[PDB]
Amino acid sequence: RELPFKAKHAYSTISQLSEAIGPRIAGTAAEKKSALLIASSMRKLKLDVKVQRFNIPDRLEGTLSSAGRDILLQAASGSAPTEEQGLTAPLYNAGLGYQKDFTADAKGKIALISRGDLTYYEKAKNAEAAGAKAVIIYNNKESLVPMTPNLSGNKVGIPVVGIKKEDGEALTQQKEATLKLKAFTNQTSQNIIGIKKPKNIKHPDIVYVTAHYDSVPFSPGANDNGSGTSVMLEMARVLKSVPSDKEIRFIAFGAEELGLLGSSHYVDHLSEKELKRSEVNFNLDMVGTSWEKASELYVNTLDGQSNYVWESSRTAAEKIGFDSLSLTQGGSSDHVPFHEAGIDSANFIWGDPETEEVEPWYHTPEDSIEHISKERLQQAGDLVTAAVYEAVKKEKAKASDIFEDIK
Ligand SMILES: [Zn+2]
Ligand SMILES: [Zn+2]
């Protein structure tokens, strides 16, 4: 029947998350404020809401200087802090960070490594095995912000930081640098779970509609992923008055940008009973960009194969007349823990129909509401709402499929 998804509602939610709150870094007060907002919104929708808390890694922050130049940095989660006075050591130019690039001269020095070829972890691991005191990785691409040198969930015993291209290029000419990094401990995040349960069905099939509500540092996260969070909530509003024998769980996942930490926690804590009842996960991540080229709505499965999510989406696209739906392979969002547990899942995201690429604003301060399209929210919202309606109406992954920006 009629499913009045309204993108204006989603836009309003994106404004609340990305403008009134701003960047929602995992573990920070902004993410906790966002969780309160999402929980409050779900309760308005007649949902049974719980907040599920979980520990996340220490958060590293600090500064870097050399020859009087202060350099903005982003510290890698899972690397070491410094003493409060900071770590001062000579710089060692290690090129791209292959094993061959570390001579005996590297021991006791801060390894300066250009991004490229190798993963950030491989670079940091090669430097540490070579006796480096710390690792500075500088971007090989221009960017508004220093790159995060994501370590693919590994732990490194020395500091690892990422800096901008022009800063690293200057650093290749300097003798030494000082790094000051503090670890903030006791970090926690949370998931917000709102359940629409059928009143007199015993052990119903479970359908998950999910989106992560955290963003990367310095990004307002309007599209990644205020958009998916907002479309998930508006779909919950639409489906509130839809009878169903399925148990529908709408979930806002925390700490996705650190490696799917919230969805991994959530799926890990499902009982075996719930896993057997688990039917399908529709994950929404980046569904509102205004970027003109991102005209194709992709359905990403971890193996690129069809599953129940694709079937329902294919059917929905036919019912609403939408011809720019494509099935493709992709991980690195919260559908992945569901897939690993054997539950049909997929991630919905707009992409360049030529190449699948996303907007240039991704993971930058320009991931802002200025670059959100209500028409894209509306079309994505109408498609996934119809797909979930089709599903509910009555009658281990490799590191590069888990993490984002690992090289
Ligand atoms: Zn995302
Ligand atoms: Zn992201």
PDB file of C-alpha atoms in Angstrom, residues 12-248:
ATOM      1  CA  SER A  12      15.959  17.479   9.463  1.00  0.00           C
ATOM      2  CA  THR A  13      17.595  14.538  11.240  1.00  0.00           C
ATOM      3  CA  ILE A  14      20.804  15.030   9.249  1.00  0.00           C
ATOM      4  CA  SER A  15      20.844  18.702  10.296  1.00  0.00           C
ATOM      5  CA  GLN A  16      20.432  17.719  13.939  1.00  0.00           C
ATOM      6  CA  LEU A  17      23.292  15.229  13.708  1.00  0.00           C
ATOM      7  CA  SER A  18      25.759  17.033  11.440  1.00  0.00           C
ATOM      8  CA  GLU A  19      24.995  20.715  12.171  1.00  0.00           C
ATOM      9  CA  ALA A  20      23.530  20.970  15.671  1.00  0.00           C
ATOM     10  CA  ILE A  21      25.928  18.310  16.959  1.00  0.00           C
ATOM     11  CA  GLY A  22      28.633  18.117  14.293  1.00  0.00           C
ATOM     12  CA  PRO A  23      31.371  15.487  13.935  1.00  0.00           C
ATOM     13  CA  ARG A  24      30.380  12.416  15.958  1.00  0.00           C
ATOM     14  CA  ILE A  25      33.694  10.748  16.712  1.00  0.00           C
ATOM     15  CA  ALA A  26      33.325   7.324  18.323  1.00  0.00           C
ATOM     16  CA  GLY A  27      33.551   7.548  22.106  1.00  0.00           C
ATOM     17  CA  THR A  28      33.143  11.312  22.295  1.00  0.00           C
ATOM     18  CA  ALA A  29      30.498  13.475  23.914  1.00  0.00           C
ATOM     19  CA  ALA A  30      29.121  14.253  20.441  1.00  0.00           C
ATOM     20  CA  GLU A  31      28.480  10.579  19.763  1.00  0.00           C
ATOM     21  CA  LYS A  32      26.826  10.187  23.167  1.00  0.00           C
ATOM     22  CA  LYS A  33      24.644  13.259  22.539  1.00  0.00           C
ATOM     23  CA  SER A  34      23.674  11.735  19.189  1.00  0.00           C
ATOM     24  CA  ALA A  35      22.723   8.464  20.881  1.00  0.00           C
ATOM     25  CA  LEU A  36      20.386  10.362  23.209  1.00  0.00           C
ATOM     26  CA  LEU A  37      18.800  12.075  20.208  1.00  0.00           C
ATOM     27  CA  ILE A  38      18.331   8.820  18.296  1.00  0.00           C
ATOM     28  CA  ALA A  39      16.895   7.001  21.315  1.00  0.00           C
ATOM     29  CA  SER A  40      14.449   9.841  21.910  1.00  0.00           C
ATOM     30  CA  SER A  41      13.415   9.761  18.244  1.00  0.00           C
ATOM     31  CA  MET A  42      12.848   5.996  18.273  1.00  0.00           C
ATOM     32  CA  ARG A  43      10.698   6.169  21.402  1.00  0.00           C
ATOM     33  CA  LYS A  44       8.418   8.652  19.635  1.00  0.00           C
ATOM     34  CA  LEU A  45       7.860   5.930  17.009  1.00  0.00           C
ATOM     35  CA  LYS A  46       6.315   3.377  19.424  1.00  0.00           C
ATOM     36  CA  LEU A  47       9.592   1.412  19.435  1.00  0.00           C
ATOM     37  CA  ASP A  48      10.907  -0.587  22.389  1.00  0.00           C
ATOM     38  CA  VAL A  49      14.302   1.088  22.755  1.00  0.00           C
ATOM     39  CA  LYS A  50      17.454  -0.103  24.513  1.00  0.00           C
ATOM     40  CA  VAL A  51      20.923   1.440  24.697  1.00  0.00           C
ATOM     41  CA  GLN A  52      23.651  -1.187  24.383  1.00  0.00           C
ATOM     42  CA  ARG A  53      27.028   0.035  25.660  1.00  0.00           C
ATOM     43  CA  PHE A  54      30.424  -1.421  24.776  1.00  0.00           C
ATOM     44  CA  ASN A  55      34.084  -0.619  25.351  1.00  0.00           C
ATOM     45  CA  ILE A  56      36.208   0.712  22.499  1.00  0.00           C
ATOM     46  CA  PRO A  57      39.982   1.354  22.218  1.00  0.00           C
ATOM     47  CA  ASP A  58      41.781   4.277  23.784  1.00  0.00           C
ATOM     48  CA  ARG A  59      41.621   7.469  21.750  1.00  0.00           C
ATOM     49  CA  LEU A  60      44.927   9.125  20.869  1.00  0.00           C
ATOM     50  CA  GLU A  61      45.347  12.854  20.321  1.00  0.00           C
ATOM     51  CA  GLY A  62      48.225  15.267  20.205  1.00  0.00           C
ATOM     52  CA  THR A  63      50.672  17.386  18.288  1.00  0.00           C
ATOM     53  CA  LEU A  64      53.806  17.289  16.184  1.00  0.00           C
ATOM     54  CA  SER A  65      56.446  19.931  15.545  1.00  0.00           C
ATOM     55  CA  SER A  66      59.750  20.204  13.726  1.00  0.00           C
ATOM     56  CA  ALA A  67      62.072  23.198  13.354  1.00  0.00           C
ATOM     57  CA  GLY A  68      59.335  25.475  14.679  1.00  0.00           C
ATOM     58  CA  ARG A  69      56.638  24.203  12.301  1.00  0.00           C
ATOM     59  CA  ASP A  70      53.519  22.822  13.954  1.00  0.00           C
ATOM     60  CA  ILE A  71      51.937  19.977  11.991  1.00  0.00           C
ATOM     61  CA  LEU A  72      48.350  18.781  12.296  1.00  0.00           C
ATOM     62  CA  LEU A  73      48.106  15.031  12.782  1.00  0.00           C
ATOM     63  CA  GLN A  74      45.674  12.175  13.191  1.00  0.00           C
ATOM     64  CA  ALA A  75      46.875   9.385  15.452  1.00  0.00           C
ATOM     65  CA  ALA A  76      46.216   5.764  14.579  1.00  0.00           C
ATOM     66  CA  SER A  77      43.889   3.905  16.911  1.00  0.00           C
ATOM     67  CA  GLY A  78      45.832   1.085  18.528  1.00  0.00           C
ATOM     68  CA  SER A  79      49.221   2.820  18.499  1.00  0.00           C
ATOM     69  CA  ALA A  80      51.245   4.075  21.464  1.00  0.00           C
ATOM     70  CA  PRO A  81      51.112   7.493  23.138  1.00  0.00           C
ATOM     71  CA  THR A  82      54.183   9.416  24.267  1.00  0.00           C
ATOM     72  CA  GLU A  83      55.372  10.631  27.607  1.00  0.00           C
ATOM     73  CA  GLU A  84      53.882  13.992  28.548  1.00  0.00           C
ATOM     74  CA  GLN A  85      57.128  15.800  27.699  1.00  0.00           C
ATOM     75  CA  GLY A  86      56.843  14.195  24.258  1.00  0.00           C
ATOM     76  CA  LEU A  87      59.072  12.057  22.068  1.00  0.00           C
ATOM     77  CA  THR A  88      61.929  13.900  20.333  1.00  0.00           C
ATOM     78  CA  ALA A  89      64.142  11.903  17.980  1.00  0.00           C
ATOM     79  CA  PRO A  90      65.913  12.307  14.634  1.00  0.00           C
ATOM     80  CA  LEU A  91      63.863  11.755  11.493  1.00  0.00           C
ATOM     81  CA  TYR A  92      64.608   8.805   9.198  1.00  0.00           C
ATOM     82  CA  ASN A  93      63.323   8.962   5.617  1.00  0.00           C
ATOM     83  CA  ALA A  94      61.951   5.511   4.794  1.00  0.00           C
ATOM     84  CA  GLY A  95      60.285   6.129   1.431  1.00  0.00           C
ATOM     85  CA  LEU A  96      57.247   3.857   1.153  1.00  0.00           C
ATOM     86  CA  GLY A  97      58.224   1.723   4.151  1.00  0.00           C
ATOM     87  CA  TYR A  98      59.249  -1.591   2.614  1.00  0.00           C
ATOM     88  CA  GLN A  99      61.610  -3.714   4.694  1.00  0.00           C
ATOM     89  CA  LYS A 100      64.427  -2.794   2.294  1.00  0.00           C
ATOM     90  CA  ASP A 101      63.833   0.902   3.089  1.00  0.00           C
ATOM     91  CA  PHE A 102      64.990   0.553   6.721  1.00  0.00           C
ATOM     92  CA  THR A 103      68.769   0.546   7.158  1.00  0.00           C
ATOM     93  CA  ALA A 104      70.595   0.199  10.472  1.00  0.00           C
ATOM     94  CA  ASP A 105      70.297   4.008  10.620  1.00  0.00           C
ATOM     95  CA  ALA A 106      66.561   3.642  11.338  1.00  0.00           C
ATOM     96  CA  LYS A 107      66.948   2.386  14.923  1.00  0.00           C
ATOM     97  CA  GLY A 108      66.046   5.035  17.502  1.00  0.00           C
ATOM     98  CA  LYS A 109      64.610   7.450  14.915  1.00  0.00           C
ATOM     99  CA  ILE A 110      61.130   8.560  13.897  1.00  0.00           C
ATOM    100  CA  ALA A 111      60.370   6.859  10.584  1.00  0.00           C
ATOM    101  CA  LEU A 112      58.905   9.243   8.006  1.00  0.00           C
ATOM    102  CA  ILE A 113      56.994   7.180   5.440  1.00  0.00           C
ATOM    103  CA  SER A 114      55.077   8.295   2.394  1.00  0.00           C
ATOM    104  CA  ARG A 115      51.665   6.788   1.884  1.00  0.00           C
ATOM    105  CA  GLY A 116      51.446   4.328  -1.003  1.00  0.00           C
ATOM    106  CA  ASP A 117      51.664   0.693  -2.147  1.00  0.00           C
ATOM    107  CA  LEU A 118      51.636  -0.884   1.339  1.00  0.00           C
ATOM    108  CA  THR A 119      48.969  -0.782   4.007  1.00  0.00           C
ATOM    109  CA  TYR A 120      49.533   1.593   6.910  1.00  0.00           C
ATOM    110  CA  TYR A 121      49.936  -1.375   9.241  1.00  0.00           C
ATOM    111  CA  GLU A 122      52.641  -2.909   7.025  1.00  0.00           C
ATOM    112  CA  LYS A 123      54.531   0.392   7.025  1.00  0.00           C
ATOM    113  CA  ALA A 124      54.262   0.790  10.802  1.00  0.00           C
ATOM    114  CA  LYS A 125      55.179  -2.845  11.440  1.00  0.00           C
ATOM    115  CA  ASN A 126      58.256  -2.590   9.204  1.00  0.00           C
ATOM    116  CA  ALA A 127      59.337   0.583  10.993  1.00  0.00           C
ATOM    117  CA  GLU A 128      58.853  -0.911  14.459  1.00  0.00           C
ATOM    118  CA  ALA A 129      60.754  -4.093  13.588  1.00  0.00           C
ATOM    119  CA  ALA A 130      63.520  -1.786  12.325  1.00  0.00           C
ATOM    120  CA  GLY A 131      63.726  -0.149  15.757  1.00  0.00           C
ATOM    121  CA  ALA A 132      61.898   3.085  14.944  1.00  0.00           C
ATOM    122  CA  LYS A 133      60.729   5.140  17.915  1.00  0.00           C
ATOM    123  CA  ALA A 134      57.593   6.336  16.076  1.00  0.00           C
ATOM    124  CA  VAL A 135      56.054   6.436  12.603  1.00  0.00           C
ATOM    125  CA  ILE A 136      54.842   9.506  10.726  1.00  0.00           C
ATOM    126  CA  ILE A 137      52.974   8.613   7.531  1.00  0.00           C
ATOM    127  CA  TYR A 138      52.246  11.497   5.177  1.00  0.00           C
ATOM    128  CA  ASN A 139      49.589  11.536   2.482  1.00  0.00           C
ATOM    129  CA  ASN A 140      50.577  11.207  -1.163  1.00  0.00           C
ATOM    130  CA  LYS A 141      47.353  13.044  -2.063  1.00  0.00           C
ATOM    131  CA  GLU A 142      46.262  16.585  -1.319  1.00  0.00           C
ATOM    132  CA  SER A 143      43.555  16.800   1.335  1.00  0.00           C
ATOM    133  CA  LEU A 144      41.874  19.295   3.652  1.00  0.00           C
ATOM    134  CA  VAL A 145      42.835  17.231   6.713  1.00  0.00           C
ATOM    135  CA  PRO A 146      45.674  14.938   7.768  1.00  0.00           C
ATOM    136  CA  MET A 147      45.041  11.312   6.856  1.00  0.00           C
ATOM    137  CA  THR A 148      44.222   8.735   9.519  1.00  0.00           C
ATOM    138  CA  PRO A 149      46.808   5.886   9.305  1.00  0.00           C
ATOM    139  CA  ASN A 150      44.308   3.105  10.091  1.00  0.00           C
ATOM    140  CA  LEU A 151      46.132   0.014  11.374  1.00  0.00           C
ATOM    141  CA  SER A 152      43.496  -2.569  10.285  1.00  0.00           C
ATOM    142  CA  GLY A 153      42.702  -3.324  13.921  1.00  0.00           C
ATOM    143  CA  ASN A 154      46.278  -4.287  14.774  1.00  0.00           C
ATOM    144  CA  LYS A 155      48.225  -2.980  17.743  1.00  0.00           C
ATOM    145  CA  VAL A 156      51.559  -1.223  17.239  1.00  0.00           C
ATOM    146  CA  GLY A 157      53.938  -0.574  20.129  1.00  0.00           C
ATOM    147  CA  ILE A 158      55.181   2.830  18.964  1.00  0.00           C
ATOM    148  CA  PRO A 159      53.264   6.006  18.071  1.00  0.00           C
ATOM    149  CA  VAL A 160      51.788   6.086  14.556  1.00  0.00           C
ATOM    150  CA  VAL A 161      50.424   9.356  13.143  1.00  0.00           C
ATOM    151  CA  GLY A 162      49.269  10.582   9.749  1.00  0.00           C
ATOM    152  CA  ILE A 163      49.909  14.066   8.380  1.00  0.00           C
ATOM    153  CA  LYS A 164      49.212  16.073   5.247  1.00  0.00           C
ATOM    154  CA  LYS A 165      51.230  15.669   2.054  1.00  0.00           C
ATOM    155  CA  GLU A 166      52.861  19.108   2.041  1.00  0.00           C
ATOM    156  CA  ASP A 167      53.791  18.729   5.715  1.00  0.00           C
ATOM    157  CA  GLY A 168      55.501  15.383   5.187  1.00  0.00           C
ATOM    158  CA  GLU A 169      57.330  16.776   2.162  1.00  0.00           C
ATOM    159  CA  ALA A 170      58.722  19.558   4.342  1.00  0.00           C
ATOM    160  CA  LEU A 171      59.599  17.025   7.055  1.00  0.00           C
ATOM    161  CA  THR A 172      61.769  15.033   4.636  1.00  0.00           C
ATOM    162  CA  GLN A 173      64.207  17.960   4.843  1.00  0.00           C
ATOM    163  CA  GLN A 174      64.316  18.333   8.656  1.00  0.00           C
ATOM    164  CA  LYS A 175      66.679  16.769  11.169  1.00  0.00           C
ATOM    165  CA  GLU A 176      64.307  15.852  14.011  1.00  0.00           C
ATOM    166  CA  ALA A 177      60.744  16.120  15.264  1.00  0.00           C
ATOM    167  CA  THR A 178      58.843  16.067  18.552  1.00  0.00           C
ATOM    168  CA  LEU A 179      55.609  14.118  18.976  1.00  0.00           C
ATOM    169  CA  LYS A 180      53.247  14.641  21.926  1.00  0.00           C
ATOM    170  CA  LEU A 181      50.418  12.102  22.118  1.00  0.00           C
ATOM    171  CA  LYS A 182      48.033  11.352  24.977  1.00  0.00           C
ATOM    172  CA  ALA A 183      45.803   8.277  25.202  1.00  0.00           C
ATOM    173  CA  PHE A 184      42.283   8.855  26.486  1.00  0.00           C
ATOM    174  CA  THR A 185      41.168   5.665  28.230  1.00  0.00           C
ATOM    175  CA  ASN A 186      37.859   4.254  29.485  1.00  0.00           C
ATOM    176  CA  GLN A 187      36.384   4.930  26.033  1.00  0.00           C
ATOM    177  CA  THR A 188      32.928   3.540  25.329  1.00  0.00           C
ATOM    178  CA  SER A 189      30.368   3.745  22.565  1.00  0.00           C
ATOM    179  CA  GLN A 190      26.814   2.491  22.248  1.00  0.00           C
ATOM    180  CA  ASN A 191      24.192   1.106  19.909  1.00  0.00           C
ATOM    181  CA  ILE A 192      20.578   2.275  19.953  1.00  0.00           C
ATOM    182  CA  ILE A 193      18.111  -0.521  19.265  1.00  0.00           C
ATOM    183  CA  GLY A 194      14.433   0.154  18.627  1.00  0.00           C
ATOM    184  CA  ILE A 195      12.274  -2.943  18.173  1.00  0.00           C
ATOM    185  CA  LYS A 196       8.872  -3.283  16.513  1.00  0.00           C
ATOM    186  CA  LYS A 197       7.668  -6.620  17.821  1.00  0.00           C
ATOM    187  CA  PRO A 198       4.501  -8.487  16.779  1.00  0.00           C
ATOM    188  CA  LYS A 199       2.217  -8.997  19.743  1.00  0.00           C
ATOM    189  CA  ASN A 200       1.237 -12.666  19.445  1.00  0.00           C
ATOM    190  CA  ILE A 201       3.859 -14.289  17.238  1.00  0.00           C
ATOM    191  CA  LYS A 202       6.178 -16.628  19.134  1.00  0.00           C
ATOM    192  CA  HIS A 203       9.830 -16.648  18.032  1.00  0.00           C
ATOM    193  CA  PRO A 204       9.276 -14.362  15.004  1.00  0.00           C
ATOM    194  CA  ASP A 205      11.736 -13.973  12.155  1.00  0.00           C
ATOM    195  CA  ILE A 206      13.984 -10.947  12.751  1.00  0.00           C
ATOM    196  CA  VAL A 207      14.602  -8.195  10.180  1.00  0.00           C
ATOM    197  CA  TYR A 208      17.356  -5.661  10.904  1.00  0.00           C
ATOM    198  CA  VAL A 209      17.354  -2.104   9.499  1.00  0.00           C
ATOM    199  CA  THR A 210      20.635  -0.503  10.453  1.00  0.00           C
ATOM    200  CA  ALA A 211      22.906   2.504  10.031  1.00  0.00           C
ATOM    201  CA  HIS A 212      25.977   3.810  11.845  1.00  0.00           C
ATOM    202  CA  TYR A 213      25.681   7.215  13.477  1.00  0.00           C
ATOM    203  CA  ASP A 214      29.348   8.001  14.141  1.00  0.00           C
ATOM    204  CA  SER A 215      31.645   9.923  11.789  1.00  0.00           C
ATOM    205  CA  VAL A 216      35.398  10.362  11.314  1.00  0.00           C
ATOM    206  CA  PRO A 217      37.260  13.253  12.986  1.00  0.00           C
ATOM    207  CA  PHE A 218      36.735  16.703  11.419  1.00  0.00           C
ATOM    208  CA  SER A 219      33.847  15.426   9.301  1.00  0.00           C
ATOM    209  CA  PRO A 220      30.282  16.567  10.075  1.00  0.00           C
ATOM    210  CA  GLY A 221      29.331  13.163   8.675  1.00  0.00           C
ATOM    211  CA  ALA A 222      26.251  14.465   6.900  1.00  0.00           C
ATOM    212  CA  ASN A 223      26.367  11.735   4.256  1.00  0.00           C
ATOM    213  CA  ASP A 224      28.724   9.279   6.078  1.00  0.00           C
ATOM    214  CA  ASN A 225      26.503   8.497   7.791  1.00  0.00           C
ATOM    215  CA  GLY A 226      23.921  10.984   8.981  1.00  0.00           C
ATOM    216  CA  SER A 227      22.119  10.059   5.775  1.00  0.00           C
ATOM    217  CA  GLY A 228      21.727   6.366   6.576  1.00  0.00           C
ATOM    218  CA  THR A 229      20.820   7.068  10.191  1.00  0.00           C
ATOM    219  CA  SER A 230      18.172   9.545   9.046  1.00  0.00           C
ATOM    220  CA  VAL A 231      16.687   7.244   6.386  1.00  0.00           C
ATOM    221  CA  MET A 232      16.582   4.389   8.884  1.00  0.00           C
ATOM    222  CA  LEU A 233      14.637   6.564  11.343  1.00  0.00           C
ATOM    223  CA  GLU A 234      12.187   7.815   8.729  1.00  0.00           C
ATOM    224  CA  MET A 235      11.622   4.257   7.538  1.00  0.00           C
ATOM    225  CA  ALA A 236      10.836   3.329  11.145  1.00  0.00           C
ATOM    226  CA  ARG A 237       8.276   6.146  11.184  1.00  0.00           C
ATOM    227  CA  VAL A 238       6.702   4.853   7.971  1.00  0.00           C
ATOM    228  CA  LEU A 239       6.697   1.205   9.074  1.00  0.00           C
ATOM    229  CA  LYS A 240       5.326   2.044  12.536  1.00  0.00           C
ATOM    230  CA  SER A 241       1.753   1.683  11.228  1.00  0.00           C
ATOM    231  CA  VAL A 242       2.428  -1.400   9.053  1.00  0.00           C
ATOM    232  CA  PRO A 243       1.229  -4.781  10.397  1.00  0.00           C
ATOM    233  CA  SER A 244       3.871  -7.499  10.300  1.00  0.00           C
ATOM    234  CA  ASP A 245       4.644 -10.915  11.770  1.00  0.00           C
ATOM    235  CA  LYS A 246       8.370 -10.150  11.649  1.00  0.00           C
ATOM    236  CA  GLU A 247      10.289  -8.643  14.535  1.00  0.00           C
ATOM    237  CA  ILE A 248      11.880  -5.506  13.085  1.00  0.00           C
TER     238      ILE A 248
END
